Amino acid sequence: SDFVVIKALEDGVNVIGLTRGADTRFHHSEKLDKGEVLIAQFTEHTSAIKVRGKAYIQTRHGVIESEGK
Amino acid sequence: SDFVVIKALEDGVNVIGLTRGADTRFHHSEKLDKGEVLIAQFTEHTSAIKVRGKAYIQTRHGVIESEG
Amino acid sequence: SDFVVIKALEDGVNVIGLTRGADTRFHHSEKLDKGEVLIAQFTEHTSAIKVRGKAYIQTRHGVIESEGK
Amino acid sequence: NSDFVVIKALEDGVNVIGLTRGADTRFHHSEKLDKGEVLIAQFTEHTSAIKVRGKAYIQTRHGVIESEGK
Amino acid sequence: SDFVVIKALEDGVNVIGLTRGADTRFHHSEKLDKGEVLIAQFTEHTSAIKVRGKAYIQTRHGVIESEGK
Amino acid sequence: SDFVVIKALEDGVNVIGLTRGADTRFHHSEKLDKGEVLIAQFTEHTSAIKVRGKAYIQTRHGVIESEGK
Amino acid sequence: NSDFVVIKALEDGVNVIGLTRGADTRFHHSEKLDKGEVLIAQFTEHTSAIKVRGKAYIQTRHGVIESEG
Amino acid sequence: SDFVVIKALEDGVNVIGLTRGADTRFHHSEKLDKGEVLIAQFTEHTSAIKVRGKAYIQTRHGVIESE
Amino acid sequence: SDFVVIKALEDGVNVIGLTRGADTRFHHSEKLDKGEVLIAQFTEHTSAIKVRGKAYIQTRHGVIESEG
Amino acid sequence: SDFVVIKALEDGVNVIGLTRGADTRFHHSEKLDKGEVLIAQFTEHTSAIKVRGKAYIQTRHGVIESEGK
Amino acid sequence: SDFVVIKALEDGVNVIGLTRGADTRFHHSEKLDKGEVLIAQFTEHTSAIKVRGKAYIQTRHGVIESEGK
Numbered sequence: 188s189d190f191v192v193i194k195a196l197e198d199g200v201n202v203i204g205l206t207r208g209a210d211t212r213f214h215h216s217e218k219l220d221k222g223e224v225l226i227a228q229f230t231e232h233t234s235a236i237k238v239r240g241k242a243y244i245q246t247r248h249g250v251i252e253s254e255g256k
Numbered sequence: 257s258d259f260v261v262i263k264a265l266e267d268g269v270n271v272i273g274l275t276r277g278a279d280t281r282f283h284h285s286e287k288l289d290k291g292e293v294l295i296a297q298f299t300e301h302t303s304a305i306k307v308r309g310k311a312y313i314q315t316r317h318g319v320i321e322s323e324g
Numbered sequence: 325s326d327f328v329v330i331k332a333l334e335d336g337v338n339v340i341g342l343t344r345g346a347d348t349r350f351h352h353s354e355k356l357d358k359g360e361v362l363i364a365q366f367t368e369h370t371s372a373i374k375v376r377g378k379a380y381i382q383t384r385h386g387v388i389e390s391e392g393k
Numbered sequence: 394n395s396d397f398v399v400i401k402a403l404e405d406g407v408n409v410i411g412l413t414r415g416a417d418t419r420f421h422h423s424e425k426l427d428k429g430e431v432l433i434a435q436f437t438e439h440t441s442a443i444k445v446r447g448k449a450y451i452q453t454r455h456g457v458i459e460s461e462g463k
Numbered sequence: 464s465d466f467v468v469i470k471a472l473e474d475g476v477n478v479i480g481l482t483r484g485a486d487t488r489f490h491h492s493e494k495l496d497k498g499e500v501l502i503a504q505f506t507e508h509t510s511a512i513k514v515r516g517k518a519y520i521q522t523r524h525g526v527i528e529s530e531g532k
Numbered sequence: 533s534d535f536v537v538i539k540a541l542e543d544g545v546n547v548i549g550l551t552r553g554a555d556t557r558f559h560h561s562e563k564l565d566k567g568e569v570l571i572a573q574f575t576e577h578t579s580a581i582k583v584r585g586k587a588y589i590q591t592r593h594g595v596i597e598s599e600g601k
Numbered sequence: 602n603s604d605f606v607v608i609k610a611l612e613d614g615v616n617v618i619g620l621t622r623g624a625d626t627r628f629h630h631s632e633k634l635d636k637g638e639v640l641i642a643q644f645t646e647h648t649s650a651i652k653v654r655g656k657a658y659i660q661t662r663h664g665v666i667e668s669e670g
Numbered sequence: 671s672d673f674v675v676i677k678a679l680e681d682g683v684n685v686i687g688l689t690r691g692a693d694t695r696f697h698h699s700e701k702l703d704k705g706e707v708l709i710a711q712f713t714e715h716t717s718a719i720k721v722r723g724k725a726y727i728q729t730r731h732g733v734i735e736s737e
Numbered sequence: 738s739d740f741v742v743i744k745a746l747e748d749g750v751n752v753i754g755l756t757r758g759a760d761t762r763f764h765h766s767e768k769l770d771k772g773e774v775l776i777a778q779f780t781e782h783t784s785a786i787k788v789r790g791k792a793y794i795q796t797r798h799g800v801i802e803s804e805g
Numbered sequence: 806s807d808f809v810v811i812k813a814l815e816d817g818v819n820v821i822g823l824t825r826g827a828d829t830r831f832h833h834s835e836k837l838d839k840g841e842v843l844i845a846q847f848t849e850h851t852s853a854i855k856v857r858g859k860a861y862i863q864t865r866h867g868v869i870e871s872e873g874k
Numbered sequence: 875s876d877f878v879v880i881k882a883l884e885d886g887v888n889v890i891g892l893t894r895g896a897d898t899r900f901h902h903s904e905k906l907d908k909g910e911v912l913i914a915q916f917t918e919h920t921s922a923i924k925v926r927g928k929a930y931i932q933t934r935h936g937v938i939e940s941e942g943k
């Protein structure tokens with residue numbers, strides 16, 4: 188299954204997993220401090236990921252940067 | 257399944273999931289504020305995605321921008 | 325399954341689903357206003373899509389533009 | 394899933410015709426397009442060949458081709 | 464399955480379906496007039512396709528042109 | 533399944549299908565006259581194809597040309 | 602046949618953390634790398650996201666990324 | 671399944687099919703005269719192909735010529 | 738399944754297999770002397786590989802070098 | 806499965822098939838004379854192939870040449 | 875499965891198969907003299923291959939060369 192790379196460019200970046208299925212809510216929030224890298228798959232439980240905070244993001248479609256709050 | 261990357265370029269962008277199946281209605285609207293990124297798949301429940309508001313969007317077919 | 329990206333270049337664009345199966349009819353018309361984007365799959369229920377109105381469209385085969393009357 | 398064709402009508406009354414899959418061949422559906430309208434259509438359980446009549450711009454996995462009307 | 468694109472470059476082009484199976488014969492002859500485009504798959508019933516008449520043909524292997532007479 | 537494109541460069545080109553299975557014999561010869569095009573698959577019944585006569589041939593491995601005597 | 606990440610520690614004490622697959626998300630394992638060591642780790646039935654903490658050079662299918670201490 | 675293209679550059683080229691399985695023998699030899707093309711798959715019955723005689727051959731790996 | 742190529746650039750390189758499953762520990766350490774090459778898959782038993790010592794490594798993602 | 810192309814550059818080249826399974830022995834040696842070409846698959850019975858003698862070899866990984874004793 | 879090409883650049887090269895499974899031991903050592911080429915798969919019985927001696931090696935990842943003691 189696909190995965191997303193997220194590198195925190197500041198402290199407190201929040202990588203939020205949203206529930207697969209008929210209902211949509213977050214099920215997990217993973218906090219990243221500056222410089223930490225999370226490599227996360229889509230899964231049986233996670234069908235959408237949201238990033239809040241300043242982060243450098245790689246996906247199969249190229250690079251994208253989130254900008255915090 | 258494929259996924260779409262949506263970066264909100266203003267506050268209040270809405271990423272709306274349309275229901276898979278014989279009926280078509282909005283089942284969920286994810287609101288993004290300026291700068292937030294959402295990476296969303298097509299799924300058993302979502303067969304079409306609508307973006308309303310200013311956003312930078314990446315799919316397998318390239319980049320496209322919605323305008324509010 | 326494949327998908328189409330449609331960006332409305334004017335108000336009142338219609339993205340119309342045609343029914344899969346021995347019967348062919350419109351089962352849904354999604355109305356888009358200027359600047360809105362719709363990313364739509366082929367599915368069990370939809371085996372052809374028709375765009376009416378001015379829109380920028382991306383498929384696996386590249387870009388194409390529909391023009392309104 | 395299956396391949397699809399993009400058809401952009403370059404004049405009014407373009408006619409996209411779906412031919413029956415199976416041992417017999419006849420049209421089962423005719424979808425008329427006005428100028429500027431786009432139809433994106435798959436091959437399916439019911440449609441194993443597609444004919445285009447009228448002036449249109451067509452994209453497939455093999456590239457671009459243009460039909461020209463009678 | 465794969466498919467062939469055939470554009471008739473004169474009237475009365477024949478796109479002919481040969482039967483899949485232990486026996487080989489024509490099961491259908493589609494007649495195309497000048498300018499008409501046919502996009503045709505290999506199928507359960509059709510394992511070979513013959514083009515007679517002047518036509519521009521695209522397959523996965525590139526372009527080829529039939530010539531009538 | 534793969535397919536071969538064959539364009540007859542003279543009259544009476546023969547595209548011959550050889551039987552899939554423990555035995556190897558000709559099961560069908562398709563005659564092409566100059567300018568006709570045959571697009572033929574490998575199948576449940578056909579596991580090798582022989583061309584005799586002058587013809588332009590395209591496969592996944594590129595172009596080749598048969599020559600008659 | 603899953604995807605994998607390559608992690609080369611650029612300083613002592615780098616942590617490569619596996620997060621559990623499923624409805625529950627927690628760290629299940631932390632592999633400590635010292636400077637110069639390389640770990641090549643797959644996504645698995647038990648690991649659906651990987652966090653890197655500490656200075657490291659990382660390779661995925663999406664290209665290179667660096668974690669910062 | 672993959673296939674090989676063989677164009678005979680002289681008369682009497684032999685394309686030979688070797689048996690798949692625990693045993694290896696020739697089950698079929700197809701004779702090609704000059705200019706004839708044979709496009710042949712690997713199969714349930716044929717797991718190796720031998721070309722004897724001068725021929726132009728194309729595979730997924732490129733061109734090669736027998737002598 | 739993917740595989741890694743490891744060429745020992747000094748004696749005593751260790752290519753270590755980590756156990757697939759809920760639990761994680763090293764189950765094997767293959768020792769390589771200078772100039773030897775090991776080509777190793779991921780497998781039912783091995784879901785992560787650690788290289789310790791100076792080595793030239795090739796994967797589907799390109800080259801990387803471990804250092805002593 | 807994949808296959809290897811072997812062209813003998815001298816007489817008496819040997820293409821040897823090693824047995825798939827817990828045991829490893831030669832089960833078949835195909836002798837090639839100069840100029841002959843053998844296109845051989847990996848199979849249920851053959852999991853490794855050894856070439857002895859001067860030959861030009863093509864695989865999916867490129868060209869290699871074996872050199873006679 | 876993937877395979878490795880090994881060309882011995884000196885006499886006495888050893889291509890060693892390591893056992894697939896919870897235990898890891900050498901099950902077979904194929905000895906190659908100078909110029910011989912071995913093309914070997916990963917298999918049900920072999921999940922890791924070791925090359926000892928001077929040899930030119932091709933894999934899907936490119937060329938690598940082993941150097942003898």
Ligand SMILES: N[C@@H](Cc1c[nH]c2ccccc12)C(=O)O
Pocket residue numbers: 205206207208209210211212234235271272273274284285286296297298299300301302305
């Ligand atoms: N629960 C929703 C989550 C989701 C995925 N993609 C989306 C796109 C838009 C809105 C919601 C979603 C689903 O699995 O379908």
Ligand SMILES: N[C@@H](Cc1c[nH]c2ccccc12)C(=O)O
Pocket residue numbers: 274275276277278279280281303304339340341342352353354364365366367368369370373
């Ligand atoms: N319920 C529809 C939603 C949809 C997907 N793609 C479409 C294209 C046009 C109209 C509606 C749709 C379906 O699953 O088929």
Ligand SMILES: N[C@@H](Cc1c[nH]c2ccccc12)C(=O)O
Pocket residue numbers: 342343344345346347348349371372409410411412422423424434435436437438439440443
């Ligand atoms: N109901 C038709 C719809 C359709 C798909 N592609 C077409 C092409 C031409 C005409 C109709 C169609 C079917 O599923 O086959």
Ligand SMILES: N[C@@H](Cc1c[nH]c2ccccc12)C(=O)O
Pocket residue numbers: 412413414415416417418419441442478479480481491492493503504505506507508509512
């Ligand atoms: N009924 C025919 C339609 C068709 C598909 N491709 C063709 C090519 C030639 C002629 C007819 C066909 C079939 O399903 O086989």
Ligand SMILES: N[C@@H](Cc1c[nH]c2ccccc12)C(=O)O
Pocket residue numbers: 481482483484485486487488510511547548549550560561562572573574575576577578581
């Ligand atoms: N009935 C034959 C038709 C055919 C397909 N490919 C061919 C090549 C040569 C001759 C005939 C054929 C078959 O299905 O096998």
Ligand SMILES: N[C@@H](Cc1c[nH]c2ccccc12)C(=O)O
Pocket residue numbers: 550551552553554555556557579580685686687688698699700710711712713714715716719
């Ligand atoms: N009956 C043979 C036909 C064949 C296919 N490829 C070949 C190569 C050589 C000789 C014969 C063949 C088979 O199905 O296996």
Ligand SMILES: N[C@@H](Cc1c[nH]c2ccccc12)C(=O)O
Pocket residue numbers: 202203204205215216217227228229230231232233236620621622623624625626627649650
């Ligand atoms: N337990 C979560 C772990 C996870 C994977 N990707 C994520 C993205 C965001 C948050 C959590 C996750 C799951 O398997 O789905």
Ligand SMILES: N[C@@H](Cc1c[nH]c2ccccc12)C(=O)O
Pocket residue numbers: 688689690691692693694695717718820821822823833834835845846847848849850851854
């Ligand atoms: N009967 C042998 C034929 C064979 C295929 N590839 C080979 C390579 C070497 C020697 C023999 C073979 C097999 O199916 O395995």
Ligand SMILES: N[C@@H](Cc1c[nH]c2ccccc12)C(=O)O
Pocket residue numbers: 617618619620630631632642643644645646647648651755756757758759760761762784785
């Ligand atoms: N036992 C773990 C080993 C592992 C694989 N990838 C990892 C990433 C991080 C930590 C541990 C691992 C597993 O199979 O899931």
Ligand SMILES: N[C@@H](Cc1c[nH]c2ccccc12)C(=O)O
Pocket residue numbers: 823824825826827828829830852853889890891892902903904914915916917918919920923
């Ligand atoms: N019988 C061994 C043959 C083999 C394949 N690849 C190898 C690599 C090294 C040594 C032996 C082999 C196997 O099937 O596993």
Ligand SMILES: N[C@@H](Cc1c[nH]c2ccccc12)C(=O)O
Pocket residue numbers: 752753754755765766767777778779780781782783786892893894895896897898899921922
């Ligand atoms: N018996 C081990 C062999 C192995 C494959 N890859 C490895 C990497 C490291 C150590 C051992 C291995 C296995 O099948 O898993």
Ligand SMILES: N[C@@H](Cc1c[nH]c2ccccc12)C(=O)O
Pocket residue numbers: 896897
């Ligand atoms: N010999 C090893 C690995 C092993 C072999 N057979 C096993 C069966 C089950 C668990 C582990 C093993 C050990 O005892 O750990």
